[PDB]
Amino acid sequence: HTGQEMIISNWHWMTLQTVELSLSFKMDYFSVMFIPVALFVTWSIMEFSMWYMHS
Amino acid sequence: EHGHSKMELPDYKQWKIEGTPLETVQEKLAARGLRDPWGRNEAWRYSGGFANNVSFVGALLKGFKWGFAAFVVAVGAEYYLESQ
């Protein structure tokens, strides 16, 4: 709709002097575009695996 | 719930080399002086629903007729509602 983009640096893991390592998530075009496609493919593959791997 | 219906093996005399490429193989072998002892064994590969075949072009154009009909109907409807 608009082009929303965000980082969530939520949990601060540690700090090595002047370097800060934290649990950070980037929600750019690539992330929001590759999320549903992978989820859809995994959904279809799992539904097929219910039949293929029944025995 | 499994497939236990006592399937019956059909008679062995139906399978005939007649009408199959194995006839041409037999002709070519007899032209040299030989015979295929297993010609009838594979005959079921050309007897039932396997007799008719499909080419590559026909395989690719699987639903071309119905898709074309739907396309013509859609374009006719589009032309008839736009010109208003």
């Binding site: 496609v37 493919v41 593959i45 539904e47 293929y52 | -």
Partner: protein, 165 residues
């Protein structure tokens, strides 16, 4: 994004064929399956057509632009040559797959156990089928522009991908 859809569908179709053919993977023992199993057949044809970049399919909207940008760029000539030969060989192996496993007379053992009547398989295949048909158009038209288009091309350079395919 496009490869995800159509390659996953192709693998699922191959797996369905393998399962229905008593765990046999060699194409030398797969014969007439265009009629023996219709849904796997049409799904695999659609997947092969999308993979080879038939126009206005999922593969077209990415692969055709790839070929267009590679041809119309300051690159090494060997790179374009190898890319075009690779596209031709892609068409070649798709042709090999379809011809060996469907068109020929059945070569599988006499005890026929081929069946497709399972809702899970049909639903899982058809979801990626509709994906491989429409995701290209919807995704390509629903994203903001991010590059300069190649508006003007020679006629022969515009059609090169289809020619080699």
């Amino acid at each position: 994004c496009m490869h995800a859809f159509f390659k996953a569908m192709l693998f699922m179709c191959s797996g369905s064929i393998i399962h229905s053919l008593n765990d046999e993977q060699d194409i030398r023992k797969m014969g007439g399956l265009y009629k023996a199993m219709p849904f796997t057949t049409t799904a695999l044809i659609i997947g092969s057509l999308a993979l080879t970049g038939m126009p206005y399919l999922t593969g077209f909207y990415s692969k055709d632009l790839i070929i267009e940008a590679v041809n119309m760029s300051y690159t090494n000539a060997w790179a374009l040559l190898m890319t075009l030969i690779a596209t031709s060989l892609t068409a070649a192996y798709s042709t090999r797959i379809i011809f060996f496993a469907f068109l020929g007379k059945p070569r599988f053992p006499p005890l026929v156990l081929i069946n497709e009547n399972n809702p899970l398989l049909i639903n899982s295949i058809k979801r990626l089928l509709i994906g491989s048909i429409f995701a290209g158009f919807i995704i390509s038209n629903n994203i903001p522009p991010m590059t300069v288009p190649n508006t003007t091309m020679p006629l022969y350079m515009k059609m090169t991908a289809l020619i080699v395919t």
